[PDB]
Amino acid sequence: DEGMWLMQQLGRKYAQMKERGLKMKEYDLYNPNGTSLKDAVVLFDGGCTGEVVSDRGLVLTNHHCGYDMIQAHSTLEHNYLENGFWAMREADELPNKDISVVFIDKIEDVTDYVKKELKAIKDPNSMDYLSPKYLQKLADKKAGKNFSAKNPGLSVEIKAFYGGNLYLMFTKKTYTDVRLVGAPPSSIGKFGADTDNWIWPRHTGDFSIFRIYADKNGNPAPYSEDNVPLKPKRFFNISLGGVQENDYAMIMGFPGTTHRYFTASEVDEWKSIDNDIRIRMRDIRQGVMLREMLADPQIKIMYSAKYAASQNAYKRAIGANWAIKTRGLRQNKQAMQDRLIAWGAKQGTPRYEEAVHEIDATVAKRADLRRRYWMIEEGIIRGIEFARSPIPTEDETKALQDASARKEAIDKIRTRYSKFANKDYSAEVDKKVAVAMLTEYLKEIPYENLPLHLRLVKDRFAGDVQAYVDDIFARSVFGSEAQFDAFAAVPSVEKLAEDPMVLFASSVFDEYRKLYNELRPYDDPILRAQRTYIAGLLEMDGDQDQFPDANLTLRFTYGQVKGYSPRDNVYYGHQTTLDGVMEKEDPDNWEFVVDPKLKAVYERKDFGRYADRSGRMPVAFCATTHTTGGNSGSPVMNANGELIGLNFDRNWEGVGGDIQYLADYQRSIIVDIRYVLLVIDKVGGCQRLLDEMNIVP
Amino acid sequence: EGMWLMQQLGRKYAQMKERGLKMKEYDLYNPNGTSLKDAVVLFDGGCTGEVVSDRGLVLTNHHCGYDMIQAHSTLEHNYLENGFWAMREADELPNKDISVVFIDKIEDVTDYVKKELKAIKDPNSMDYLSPKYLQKLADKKAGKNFSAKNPGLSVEIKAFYGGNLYLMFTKKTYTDVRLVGAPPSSIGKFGADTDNWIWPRHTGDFSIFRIYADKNGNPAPYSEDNVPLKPKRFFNISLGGVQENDYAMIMGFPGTTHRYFTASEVDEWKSIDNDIRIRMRDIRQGVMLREMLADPQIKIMYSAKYAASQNAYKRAIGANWAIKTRGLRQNKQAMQDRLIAWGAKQGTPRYEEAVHEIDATVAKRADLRRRYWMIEEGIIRGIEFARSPIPTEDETKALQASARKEAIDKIRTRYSKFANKDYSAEVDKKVAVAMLTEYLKEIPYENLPLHLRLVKDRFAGDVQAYVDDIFARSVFGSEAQFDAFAAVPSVEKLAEDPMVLFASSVFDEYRKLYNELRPYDDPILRAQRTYIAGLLEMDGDQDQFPDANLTLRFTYGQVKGYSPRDNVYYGHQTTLDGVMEKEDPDNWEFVVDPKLKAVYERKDFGRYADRSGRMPVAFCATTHTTGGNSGSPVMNANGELIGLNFDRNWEGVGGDIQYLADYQRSIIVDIRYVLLVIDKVGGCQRLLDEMNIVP
Ligand SMILES: CC1(C)CN(C(=O)NCC2CC2)C1(C)C
Ligand SMILES: CC1(C)CN(C(=O)NCC2CC2)C1(C)C
Ligand SMILES: [Cl-]
Ligand SMILES: [Cl-]
């Protein structure tokens, strides 16, 4: 509802934004024919958002966005991940392989053009209107012959919006020499760590600093020692005025996906299939994993990251199901479609009701298949590590049946075995997880729908899941290192063909691919019906308070700095402070360790001009802006367009906001820019970064 | 900030009036006439209660009346899970071993006790704190046969301010106290253990009793001819509710506080008492929880044992949080340094000498107290087979008259109580291995109970083997092993029994430590009498309240929430909406009564909801309460009943040593929620009609 608006929609939203507190001129925020604040926003490394904060190409993003680059440059001698990194001169900034920053140079509405090209319909059921290949052909045709060569660094892309009812062409400028400039220690950059993921109040200094480099003319260039920092078209001024409750705030960024035009049947499906299965299967997996980690400190070391990775979407699904249960998401989608259907009946146009009916029918028809797909994906593909154990290829099997190709096939199989049974793999933990996961899977999936090898539980093992799993490891070539070596010394095709682990892995992957192939055709009638459904919604209520679904393109959102009540008698305010970091300190818990330089800054109150009017040091704030995955690192602006923070998370209560914005619960979690500058200054001691930024009082 | 004597009302009255009190001083407490104090009772020796009708109806907590509700419950009429609502006075259930105590008169007898004490002679005598000695003085002052001339009455003298003030209480006790009403346990204990010490709180923690007496309103034991008591005073019920910042006050019987601890005593409480209880109970609870989660039959047998261990574990965590973050040690150090500077100035060194004696006694008993807490937390409460049967001298002088069978029958009865339906030898072995591993790492060989020396000497440090051997060879290791012993019993089998030797050895060491430690309490108590006398002479008795000692006190404050941590605020009031948010049908602790859920859905709140239409449940206040204040009446500025105290938040448990203005709150069930449950859940209209409800 609140919205992730197209840049083109700024004109028709401007008066509402001004009434909510916006003070800057419209064209200073976004001008299609000139320089604006939009020119200081980048897509950071294909996922995250970033922002240019100096005339020498300095870029701020999240610590979790620059995490891989900080890790790749870290060694035992210089652990930047643990201690932070602060290049004291431009020449000390570290280059990064496979990095990019994307500027959105121009945005053009090309709807009439794409719709005229589409009229050359060979098949009315064609999915070319959503095809990246087809749309790229139209983008190249419009840009001209050899556009990439005529304009080095630039590229053109056409994307569909509103389910294929609007098309925009983006002219992008990409830079691949982006150097690591600064990062706080992980104790600040990821303070809450996984315990505080999706949590408000939040006390995390989630930022990192990069610098865009380019050739002598400021044109994109790959890494070269002769590259010079980019002098950009526009950069953000940093505000030190802070935030107050009810202050206007706005964000620009690249939200990835939303499902704002789901029917009520799609909400029911998301809850009853997607979320309930992910919740149930991950709770079983996590429960066994946690019991084993708590009983053996060596298991805790090997499985902590696997446990944390599973918990992230598990928490999301719990938050999403809480919104479906308590915030009326299904009911509000039903009211939306019923209103369109009633209006369609008055206009004498039954195609909208026919479109909603096609979506409902497709959802109802794919129910059993989708349930089986989520059950195998959550239960086995993700749930059981030995499902990703080695499967010999057709060429590897042929190589084992008279040439030196046998030793080559064995070396390839060994490399894959060694990756599966790595230093973090416990066959004992995996057997315990598999027994609990398969017990649940076998209770849900009938015999006739089982992957072929799982039929052996009832047929050969008399329903004993433990015995079936024990037999897989006792008899398999991948059951232990000594069993692999005995196989590698005397390898035979017939040994691999009857291997219980190979047959399990092959069988479950065969069923997973068969389900995917049978389910994929159901997406197309839904997409085609959504084009008609969204066209009706737009014709009926206008593209005014109905934003297009997020699709990894540049959007703006506006709101206010505001807390919320999570439950009865509990209020979370709009701002966290450095005192909250100190309250959470736990020296013997890696997630809640506090940097000694930061603790000393707090004790001496060495907050400089970064503290609020009451002398308290701010850390983070939350706002009613509408964000999602892809908005990590987004610049948060004042009513004047000055940088007041970086978006880095959203509270779990608002994750249902991808389907329906939740005004009373959904908040963007933002690191206060005053805390960012305090850390650069008093922790990093990197004064040159402060001096190159334009800091406004 | 304090738990004030009724005598201190005169000196506090002006401050209470400035804070909002509207009632006249003598309407609250009158030393020579009827007052609101006359409607407060000590309920069943621990809790507080209050009379709420001219027919002796009493309100207290559900957890205070829990044992009486349970004793009257059967499979056919399970009052604990269903609730109980007597539809007529004749249907109210009598209770054996119940009592209600009224505080008829209170008198300052300090000069009298101090004159009697002057004839002691031994300066180190502890008679000044002895209940036996003080009872002799109470009887001497009351008369030759006071209880005969005044039936139902009794006297008691108690020491206050470490022996610097003495009060005589004239008590009227009633033992015919009948169960009238109780909500289901789903309401009376909604949070159950998960919400214990927690604010926000959504628990309707109340139960209803009635005092019965003879035809003249005089105390009488249970008799079918007893008539409900017509009390001299009862509380009016307010339906005006509460607002943030409203004046609130409580009367009750707080049990204990340690407001005059030295800094060294705070350090000792943290480093010994609390750290050992925390460490040992976390080990015990961790093994117990793993076993309960792996076997649903173990969860049934060990849930109550687990819950009982968690209660003081959570208290110790809350207390250590206050010591670490609220400067308790530092504030005690500043208090004693101020007294020492004032005494140096007046030329009176006895106060500095008193603080020094306390510090020296604390430092001297450190190793002994550490060993005592280690064995008590680690073994006495940590390991169930520590309380396994130990044959008496009489039982040994029977197995070697033909009363060998009489001895076996008594040993069998004790074995059957130890190895009962809730006892798992497997769970106990796992708990013992983890508890003994920690105990053996903390207690050196020369300080071990004699049998534990076998871990290093006979079992090569293998704790598991030592514990396995205790069960494999003991006559109490299993039913079949007990029966084989009972068929062919000998004293030589019991004398060498590994479980008997373990249990005897650990209890011998526990008693030896207790006996060696007990003498250290006396120099501390004597030095506290001098220490508190100095504090009172220096700063006066008006900010410095006397430690709680299970006597009637008043406390006042306001209805107010608090901020538990950065950017989080807990308001002053919870609502029925919060109960519904917490509902979890497949979690026994958070099940919601269907009649209550229907009341919420239909908004059938009558005159009980606030002006917004939201139904209140509980509220919190800045009153200073502790254990003993459960069931206490919470009063308005007009003295009308607005709630019942039933808990305190964990952040304020350090309040027994130092009141915490920004964190400590009394957790109270809103009287409007009590009346909504009696009315719409119990449907017991006669109880509403007999109360004086004011609009
Ligand atoms: C409410 C959530 C969506 C967030 N969450 C967590 O498990 N967070 C762990 C925090 C430490 C307690 C669910 C319960 C899944
Ligand atoms: C500091 C705490 C709030 C944490 N805690 C517990 O030990 N467990 C209670 C938790 C809520 C289920 C207290 C001491 C009450
Ligand atoms: Cl039509
Ligand atoms: Cl909402």
Ligand SMILES: [Cl-]
């Ligand atoms: Cl009376």
